[PDB]
Structure formats: structure tokens, C-alpha cells
Write a protein that binds this ligand. Structure first.
Ligand SMILES: Nc1ncnc2c1c(-c1cnc3[nH]ccc3c1)nn2C1CCCC1
Ligand code: NA
Length: 269
């Protein structure tokens, strides 16, 4: 393309070029094709629409993210404020999210579900085993990404959520802080697996978040759970979305499950 011949912007350090090639857009981000000028690898140049405290915590967040290298984590390269928008440079995932990828297909193949879910678990395991552990807290099919031509599946949007009761005057500061452990990622994984397995959004029968909350704090499963054909798939999902977090499967349990073991390849025909 002509568009690939002419950069339209450069990062402050000169490392990354932006091209006027729009790869995707959502409510929060617009992603362009970029280029790493040192390696000539194409990257994702993501533009997002804060106090000096939030600015410093962000830079520290980004420095840690730069160290997170793993085959099932979208790699994070750099970030800065441009003037106006915020720019994050990450690994480019050519096929967008798993949510969009699933819209092209009618019924899930067991080999694909196996393979995608195994990759997601390894990414979560990688995050949970950092020093200190990283809990994604926002895992969903719309921030799990895929490169069509390899079938590589990688967790993205890490840190994005945290980048954007009582009476406030009388509220102790520690009541704003939320601590989650690994099990909220396991629950979210279970719902991703359910969505992949049914080609259907979970709790779609609900109209609002409160209805889901009434269902989800009453511990009654989404209608799609029963539309799961394979009993072993139903059992894995059930073990991930159990209401009481101490009853939930662990990531290690899931990854050791024979369901996720790889096969011996497809026979030549
Ligand atoms: N790396 C990518 N490659 C290809 N497409 C991508 C992405 C991302 C994306 C993925 N992970 C990210 N982490 C912080 C910002 C960010 C942006 N978002 N998008 C699309 C833009 C909105 C729908 C998905
Ligand atoms: Na454009």
C-alpha cells in the first residue's frame, strides 16, 4: 500500500512510527499500524482519549509491563502523552479480539477450544507467577487477542482498566482499595470458556448489570451453561465459576487437566 510508505507520526524517542492505517476502534481505543524502527517489526499504535500522582503511578505501571514477556501475553512496548491523547505501543495482533473472531463462526471445534483455552491459562499462570503476582481483573473475550495466521492467542488490555456504601467525607481511605486474588481471573476464564463453547454471550437473558448481580450473588448459572453439550466441558466451567472462591479450581489444576493436554496432531489425509 502507499499508506505503508509514509509515516505520519513518531514516538518521542524516535523508536516507533505511526502509519495512517487504522486497524481497529472501540469506545476507548483507536489502534493504528506502527513500526519499530530498530527491528522493523510492525506494532500496534493505540491512541486513548490526570494528576502528577496518577502520572507517576502510570509510568511505574508501564515500566513493569515492559518486563512482561510471554508467548500468551500481548507485549507492551512504550507509552507517553501526546499533544492530545495517550499513546500505548504494543504487539500487533492481526485478527483483533476473540470476541470478533468468534463472530465469523457458527459452532466451536473441540481442538480449537482446547488450544485457545490452554493458551489463555498459560498467560494467566504467567501473570499469577510474577513477583509480585499480577491479577488481570478484567479478562473477557473482548480483550483476548488472536493472530489468525498462527492461532496464537494472547491476553491484552493489561492495566487498561486501572488506567481509566458510605458517606465520602467520612470514609477511611482503605475502603476504596480493592484486593482480588487469582480466583477472580479463574472465574472470568470460566465465563470466557463458556462463551467460546456456546458461541453465545453469558447471561444474555439479563437486561442490566443488577440482574446479573442478582443472578451472580444468588449463585445461579447463566442460561447458556445448560446449552453446553459436552459434560466434561460443563464440569470444568462449573468448577471455575463456583460462587464461593475457595471452591474454585486453581489455574494449576486447570492446566494439569487432561482436557487441555495437546493431541498428537491431525492425521494427514
Ligand atoms: N495489540 C492490538 N493489536 C490489534 N488490535 C488491537 C490491539 C489492541 C490493544 C491490545 N492490548 C492493549 N494493551 C494496552 C492497549 C492495548 C490495545 N486493541 N486492538 C483493537 C482495538 C479495539 C478492538 C481491538
Ligand atoms: Na483514517
Amino acid at each position: 500500500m502507499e499508506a505503508e510508505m509514509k509515516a505520519v507520526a513518531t514516538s518521542p524517542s524516535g523508536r516507533f512510527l505511526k502509519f495512517d492505517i487504522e486497524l481497529g476502534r472501540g469506545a476507548f481505543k483507536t489502534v493504528y499500524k506502527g513500526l519499530d524502527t530498530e527491528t522493523w517489526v510492525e506494532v500496534a499504535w493505540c491512541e486513548l482519549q490526570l494528576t502528577k500522582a496518577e502520572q507517576q503511578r502510570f509510568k511505574e505501571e508501564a515500566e513493569m509491563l515492559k518486563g512482561l514477556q510471554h508467548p500468551n501475553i500481548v507485549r507492551f512496548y512504550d507509552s507517553w502523552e501526546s499533544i492530545k491523547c495517550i499513546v500505548l505501543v504494543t504487539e500487533l495482533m492481526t485478527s483483533g479480539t476473540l470476541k470478533t473472531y468468534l463472530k465469523r463462526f457458527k459452532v466451536m471445534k473441540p481442538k480449537v477450544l482446547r488450544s485457545w483455552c490452554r493458551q489463555i491459562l498459560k498467560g494467566l499462570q504467567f501473570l499469577h507467577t510474577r513477583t509480585p503476582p499480577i491479577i488481570h481483573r478484567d479478562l473477557k473475550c473482548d480483550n483476548i487477542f488472536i493472530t489468525g495466521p498462527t492461532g496464537s492467542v494472547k491476553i491484552g488490555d493489561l492495566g487498561l482498566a486501572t488506567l481509566m456504601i458510605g458517606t465520602p467525607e467520612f470514609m477511611a481511605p482503605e475502603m476504596y482499595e480493592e484486593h482480588y486474588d487469582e480466583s477472580v481471573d479463574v472465574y472470568a476464564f470460566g465465563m470466557c470458556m463458556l462463551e467460546m463453547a456456546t458461541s453465545e454471550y453469558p447471561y444474555s437473558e439479563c437486561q442490566n448489570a443488577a440482574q446479573i448481580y442478582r443472578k451472580v450473588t444468588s449463585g445461579i448459572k447463566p442460561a447458556s451453561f445448560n446449552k453446553v453439550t459436552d459434560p466434561e466441558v460443563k464440569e470444568i466451567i462449573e468448577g471455575c465459576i463456583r460462587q464461593n472462591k475457595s471452591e474454585r479450581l486453581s489455574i494449576r489444576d486447570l492446566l494439569n487437566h487432561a482436557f487441555f493436554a495437546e493431541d498428537t496432531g491431525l492425521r494427514v489425509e
